[PDB]
Amino acid sequence: NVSIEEFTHFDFQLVPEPSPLDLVITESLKNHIEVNGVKSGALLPLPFQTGIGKTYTALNFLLQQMLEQVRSELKEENTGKKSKRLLYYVTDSVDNVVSAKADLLKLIEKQTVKGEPRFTLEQQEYLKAQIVHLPNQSEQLLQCSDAVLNDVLIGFNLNAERDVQAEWSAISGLRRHASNPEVKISLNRQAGYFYRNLIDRLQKKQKGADRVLLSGSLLASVETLLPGEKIRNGSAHVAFLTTSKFLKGFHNTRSRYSPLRDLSGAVLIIDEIDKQNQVILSELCKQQAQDLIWAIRTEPLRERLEEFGTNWNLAFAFNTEGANLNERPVRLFSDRSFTHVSSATHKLLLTRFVNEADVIYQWFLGTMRKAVFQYWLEGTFQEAVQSLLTHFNLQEFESAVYESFDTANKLSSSKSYHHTGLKLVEVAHNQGTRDTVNCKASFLNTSPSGVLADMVDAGAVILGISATARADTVIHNFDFKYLNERLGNKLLSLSREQKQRVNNYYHSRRNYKDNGVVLTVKYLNSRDAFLDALLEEYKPEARSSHFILNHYLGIAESEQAFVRSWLSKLLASIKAFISSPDNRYMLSLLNRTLDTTRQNINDFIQFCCDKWAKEFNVKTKTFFGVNADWMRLVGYDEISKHLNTELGKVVVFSTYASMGAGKNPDYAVNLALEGESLISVADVTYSTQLRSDIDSIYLEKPTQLLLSDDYSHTANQLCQFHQILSLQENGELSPKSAENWCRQQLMGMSRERSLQQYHQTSDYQSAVRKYIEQAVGRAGRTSLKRKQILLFVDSGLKEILAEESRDPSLFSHEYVALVNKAKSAGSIVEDRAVRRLFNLAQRNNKDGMLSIKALVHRLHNQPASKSDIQEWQDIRTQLLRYPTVAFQPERFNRLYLQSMTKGYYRYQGNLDGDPNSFEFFDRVPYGDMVSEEDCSLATLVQNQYVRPWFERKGFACSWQKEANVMTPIMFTNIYKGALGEQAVEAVLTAFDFTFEEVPNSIYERFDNRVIFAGIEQPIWLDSKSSKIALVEEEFGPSKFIYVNALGDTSKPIRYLNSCFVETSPQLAKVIEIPALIDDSNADTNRTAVQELIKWLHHS
DNA sequence: TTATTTTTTTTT
């Protein structure tokens, strides 16, 4: 055992010479420190290609962070402020976490500086003790030898308990052989459960007063059994754990440490970050559908339950009338803002009932979160969580507080789906009852992009490394338009100079041009004559090719037209490969595994391969169904071994899912079998070993791109609705399309019919190019190239790859070749930012439309809350002060829509009608316009009194000509009325009137209560009879004033009674001033104000 | 119309 004192004379300035991928990370984080500060998080997406140093420059960064903590601890050991920096390396694959851990451990041992070993052996053993790998509970238990668990069981006195020792004996006996797959599955279940129970006992023993003192061999055994113990102990910086294990959290001897709550300071390396969206999404919708009718049978929230039982009559059992709901349940879906659908029915009060119950439940969960914050480090946090729930009415409850910290918002706040989620409710008669029914509510409270932005906001310096980290899709990647809006400049990016420096590095390690490697791309069309000849030679005696496909290959007539197409393209690729003289190793990337389920197709393909092998005088080996089960049961080195030892060619039949990340395809070169066809495309080679990789590929079009979840039926619905709402949020779907897709997904949409609606976006094509960019990127992993690389592409991809228009600076050579070939025979691409502007304008208008309807309704439900009134006033003041803003505001974002013409736009729509039917920018050349000249803001602030008022209050005397303009709803319903109110308040105040806030009892019924000197009889103002009756019911005799901001001053003043009927001034109750300001010359209507003053004198 | 394979972790 060695200590940190070993680094006494170690020189921390002797760093290995950094490759242009290390300098990029160093410079980006050094810049991040200057811009954002030391204590701020970050998110640096790094598009590094696999195979040119992606994992060395990540583990060398981890090692430099490790060595920046030895220095800090040596310097600060006197001070004692030993808050360790938690370094994480997370990736979704267990096989990649272990591989990365072992690669770092080999990097520590083998790294040299200036030809000398970097670390003396004591420092090698010190640094390798800091690294803990955190596998799941089962593999963490089976990692433990008999001695470790014997010592732990004796040390905590758990050896004397017969149940624990019985379970441990059973586990040892099973592990002695562990051969059959079912045996190992049972052993894994057993190990997981026993580790659960053992760690529960350990945690209870440590939590109490009679604790165990851990030191020496017992501590070593606990730290072997519990690696998270070292992290809590302070004996390990670095954790190598998957994404799922990162979100779950790992155990230590006192609690379950969840890394998502102590991110302050964490340096987190997420490898293949874009893939984490699907993973984090799959753990977001793994929750359970928690019933609500049963739930509300279980301090102000107690009175709220009483009031719920008072109004919705909870004392009565809830029974549903009508049809039998169990044949097809009646469902309710709701994004928590502006999009709400349900199974076909005319409003069914169920929607309000279910929404009210879910509001009860969500407010209840928020109440526990606030109670925990009040009560209050994981030990104290979990103690608070356990204690608060421990009382009389919650004894039978679930206690799901932790998932909230692991995982609707008003205007005047940043509205987005990525932190409001979705709510889905399903109603059916309960198990074994017909009078009682259930409301199985399940919901998302964030999206994976919301989780990532929460992690970055919390302090974590996330460093996501993936060749397509910034792919422009939102279903197969994070929403980097939300992350840029939310995070701001904590979403780091590498500059243009750094991109071209990385590009120079990559070209230096892959110098195809100077060496003569030729990437030859061909796009394969389906040919019927080719396949018909091959089939009629496969079974000569059959009377037709369709007969061959129907009888022998087993293809029914319905799928025959599809099988012919994809089979014909694939066989064309194989023929073109085998005829290629010196190419040697092919990979076919289909969408389906050609396993035993497709054995007749395999027989035909192998027949054709043998045909062409004989014809062209080479021997070709085919590897059908190179599966995930195959690559586990039978190593991929069986291909490499064949290529290293036997002459000929190799055809490998894999899929897009099967060849995931970390499944390295290169083989070990033998110059006896390669000939003169291999050349080296690198300037300086880091190894004497010779290896080579794929040199022919077939790329079938990716088909099943809408990701789905097979965990459950209620987990598939949440995934599908998440994808629909993430497409609506990004602007890919209009609110019309998104709501039709949502309400059809409710009623039982197929998959072939959800997929056809995915295909109408441009997100789909970005996902297809993401699939094709990785497929050819995982093939080029070594610097020995053939003098000719064949790429065969499904012709369906030519029209999709031809539209790749991003910057070619980081594209691999193969993908550049694919896209350049696609372009040369393609096409005015329909701009996507333009369509996105239309869709987002419609969505912002719909959001403002429904939120204003709701807010005005709430203000009309007396009494009005202070939150609602303050939101109303915040919105009106924001629109008055900032009618148009330069940048999309973070906090008031859906009062605005981004226009195409700065300062104004055109629309047609019914502000009292359907928010989906709104049309907008030049798509409407003649329509209602939203401009300064329409609110007459120029005529209003030309008044002698109004302009000083608008200047003092800080309002806008004219609209700035900026891109973001108010939505039609905000312009019409709110802004113009705000201008009228401010103008009349300005004009009247200068004539010795005073204005005071309306009482909450009659808010929004009238503009303001106005108090004028000399009159104790109250007055009310309405500026642009039941309200009059109610106001006189509350406050007695009042005279109401109706005035306009501007208009015709020549009109006579109208004296009216309570019924809007003309009457004498002495009998006049409501005075109607046609215009306080002249519509033509902005002269104050002094005549009308004198009349009002005199009429109040004679009141 | 569109046409699939693939994981991970904790519990029950």
A517 contact partners, CB below 8 Å, separation of at least 6: A679, A681, A785, A786, A787, A788, A789
A210 contact partners, CB below 8 Å, separation of at least 6: none
Q: How far is the C-alpha of A94 from the C-alpha of A632, rounded, in Å? A: 13
Task: Decide: helix, strand or coil at residue A929.
Answer: strand
* Burial class of residue A234 in the structure, from the number of CB atoms within 10 Å of its CB (0-12 exposed, 13-18 middle, 19+ buried): exposed
A94 touches strand B (CB under 7 A): yes
Spatial CA neighbour of A477 closest among A281, A275, A282, A285: A275
Spatial CA neighbour of A277 closest among A137, A469, A89, A430: A469
**CA of A700 vs C1' of B12, distance in Å?**
43
Q: How far is the C-alpha of A624 from the C-alpha of A102, rounded, in Å? A: 32
A629 touches strand B (CB under 7 A): yes
Token digits for A867? 């939150």
Task: Decide: helix, strand or coil at residue A276.
Answer: helix
Long-range pairs for A339-342: beta carbons < 8 A, 24 or more residues apart: A339/A725, A339/A728, A339/A735, A339/A738, A339/A739, A339/A742, A341/A739, A341/A742, A341/A743, A341/A746, A342/A743, A342/A746
A107 within 8 A of A63, measured Cβ to Cβ:
yes
**CA of A237 vs C1' of B7, distance in Å?**
28
Token digits for A528? 């019927």
**CA of A731 vs C1' of B6, distance in Å?**
29
**CA of A51 vs C1' of B1, distance in Å?**
39
Q: How far is the C-alpha of A342 from the C-alpha of A737, rounded, in Å? A: 16
Spatial CA neighbour of A1023 closest among A1051, A995, A999, A1061: A995
**CA of A655 vs C1' of B3, distance in Å?**
15
**CA of A406 vs C1' of B11, distance in Å?**
17
Q: Give just the sign of the alpha carbon dihedral A625, A627, A633, A637.
A: positive
A275 touches strand B (CB under 7 A): no
Residues in chain A: 1099
Bases on strand B under 7 Å from any protein CB: 1-11
A387 touches strand B (CB under 7 A): no
Spatial CA neighbour of A859 closest among A843, A846, A844, A875: A875
Token digits for A999? 């009482």
* Burial class of residue A831 in the structure, from the number of CB atoms within 10 Å of its CB (0-12 exposed, 13-18 middle, 19+ buried): exposed
A756 touches strand B (CB under 7 A): yes
- Among all protein residues, pick the one whose CA is nearest to the C1' atom of B7: A93
A906 contact partners, CB below 8 Å, separation of at least 6: A920, A921, A922, A924, A925, A926, A927, A928, A929, A930
Phi and psi angles of residue A949, each rounded to the nearest 5 degrees, phi first: -65, -45
**CA of A752 vs C1' of B1, distance in Å?**
6
Q: Vertex A421, ends A416 and A423: CA angle to 5°?
A: 135
Q: Which nucleotide is nearest to A135 (CA to C1')?
A: B9
A62 within 8 A of A238, measured Cβ to Cβ:
yes
- Among all protein residues, pick the one whose CA is nearest to the C1' atom of B5: A657
**CA of A251 vs C1' of B7, distance in Å?**
23
> What DSSP line would sit under A949-1012, residue for residue?
HHHHTT--SS----SEEE-HHIIIIIIHHHHHHHHHHHHHHTTTEEEEPPPGGGBTTBSEEEEE
Q: How far is the C-alpha of A995 from the C-alpha of A1006, rounded, in Å? A: 12
Q: In angstroms, what is the C-alpha Rg of chain A?
A: 35
Q: How far is the C-alpha of A718 from the C-alpha of A1040, rounded, in Å? A: 53
A399 touches strand B (CB under 7 A): no
Task: Decide: helix, strand or coil at residue A655.
Answer: strand
Token digits for A1040? 């109401």
The order of strands in the sheet holding A649-655 is A518-524, A788-794, A696-699, A585-590, A649-655, A620-623
The correct answer on CATH 1.10.1760 for the domain covering A516-704+770-824 is no
Spatial CA neighbour of A150 closest among A251, A221, A79, A240: A221
- Between helices A276-284 and A713-730, what is the axis angle to 10°? 130
Q: How far is the C-alpha of A1072 from the C-alpha of A703, rounded, in Å? A: 68
* Burial class of residue A720 in the structure, from the number of CB atoms within 10 Å of its CB (0-12 exposed, 13-18 middle, 19+ buried): buried
| Domain residue ranges in chain A | 131-235, 290-446, 516-704+770-824, 713-753, 832-975, 991-1097
Burial A341-360, CB ≥16 within 10 A → b, else e: bbbeeeebebeebbebbbeb
**CA of A135 vs C1' of B9, distance in Å?**
10
> Measured over all CA atoms, what is the biggest interatomic distance in chain A, rounded to whole angstroms?
116
- Among all protein residues, pick the one whose CA is nearest to the C1' atom of B12: A193
Token digits for A124? 């090698």
Task: Decide: helix, strand or coil at residue A888.
Answer: coil
A1073 within 8 A of A1051, measured Cβ to Cβ:
no
Q: How far is the C-alpha of A880 from the C-alpha of A954, rounded, in Å? A: 9
**CA of A278 vs C1' of B6, distance in Å?**
12
* Burial class of residue A119 in the structure, from the number of CB atoms within 10 Å of its CB (0-12 exposed, 13-18 middle, 19+ buried): buried
Q: What is the DSSP letter of A410?
A: P
Q: Which nucleotide is nearest to A282 (CA to C1')?
A: B8
Q: How far is the C-alpha of A247 from the C-alpha of A451, rounded, in Å? A: 10
Token digits for A667? 């083989």
CB atoms within 10 A of CB A289: 20
**CA of A493 vs C1' of B1, distance in Å?**
40
What are the angstrom distances between the C-alpha of A5 and each of A76, A128, A129, A275? 13, 15, 14, 41
A779 within 8 A of A699, measured Cβ to Cβ:
no
**CA of A1094 vs C1' of B7, distance in Å?**
83
- Among all protein residues, pick the one whose CA is nearest to the C1' atom of B11: A193
Q: How far is the C-alpha of A422 from the C-alpha of A293, rounded, in Å? A: 20
Q: Which nucleotide is nearest to A242 (CA to C1')?
A: B8
The HSE-up count of residue A151 (CA atoms within 13 Å, CB side) is 17
- Among all protein residues, pick the one whose CA is nearest to the C1' atom of B6: A657
A648 touches strand B (CB under 7 A): no
> What DSSP line would sit under A907-920, residue for residue?
EB--TTS-GGG-B-
Spatial CA neighbour of A53 closest among A63, A65, A45, A61: A61
A761 touches strand B (CB under 7 A): no
Q: How far is the C-alpha of A322 from the C-alpha of A312, rounded, in Å? A: 20
Q: For A835, left (φ over 0), alpha (ψ -120 to 50), or beta?
A: alpha
A705 touches strand B (CB under 7 A): yes
Q: How far is the C-alpha of A423 from the C-alpha of A721, rounded, in Å? A: 9
A555 touches strand B (CB under 7 A): no
A628 touches strand B (CB under 7 A): yes
Phi and psi angles of residue A479, each rounded to the nearest 5 degrees, phi first: -80, 100
A759 touches strand B (CB under 7 A): yes
Q: Vertex A222, ends A217 and A225: CA angle to 5°?
A: 125
A95 touches strand B (CB under 7 A): yes
A881 touches strand B (CB under 7 A): no
A70 within 8 A of A108, measured Cβ to Cβ:
no
Q: How far is the C-alpha of A1012 from the C-alpha of A994, rounded, in Å? A: 6
A855 within 8 A of A869, measured Cβ to Cβ:
no
The answer to whether the bond into A300 is cis (omega within 30° of 0) is: no
- Amino acid residing at A437: V
CB atoms within 10 A of CB A552: 16
Strand A340-342, strand A330-335: pairing: antiparallel
**Token pair 């303001």: residue:** A1008
Token digits for A149? 């668990």
- Amino acid residing at A543: R
CB atoms within 10 A of CB A544: 11
Q: Which nucleotide is nearest to A756 (CA to C1')?
A: B1
Token digits for A338? 């502006």
Considering only residues 655-694 of protein chain A, which place a Cβ less than 7 A from any atom of strand B? 655, 657-658, 660
Q: How far is the C-alpha of A266 from the C-alpha of A237, rounded, in Å? A: 10
A56 touches strand B (CB under 7 A): no
A321 contact partners, CB below 8 Å, separation of at least 6: none
A515 within 8 A of A786, measured Cβ to Cβ:
no
A681 within 8 A of A515, measured Cβ to Cβ:
yes
A623 within 8 A of A593, measured Cβ to Cβ:
no
**CA of A287 vs C1' of B12, distance in Å?**
15
Q: How far is the C-alpha of A508 from the C-alpha of A741, rounded, in Å? A: 48
Q: Give just the sign of the alpha carbon dihedral A622, A628, A632, A637.
A: positive
Q: How far is the C-alpha of A114 from the C-alpha of A116, rounded, in Å? A: 6
A408 within 8 A of A420, measured Cβ to Cβ:
yes
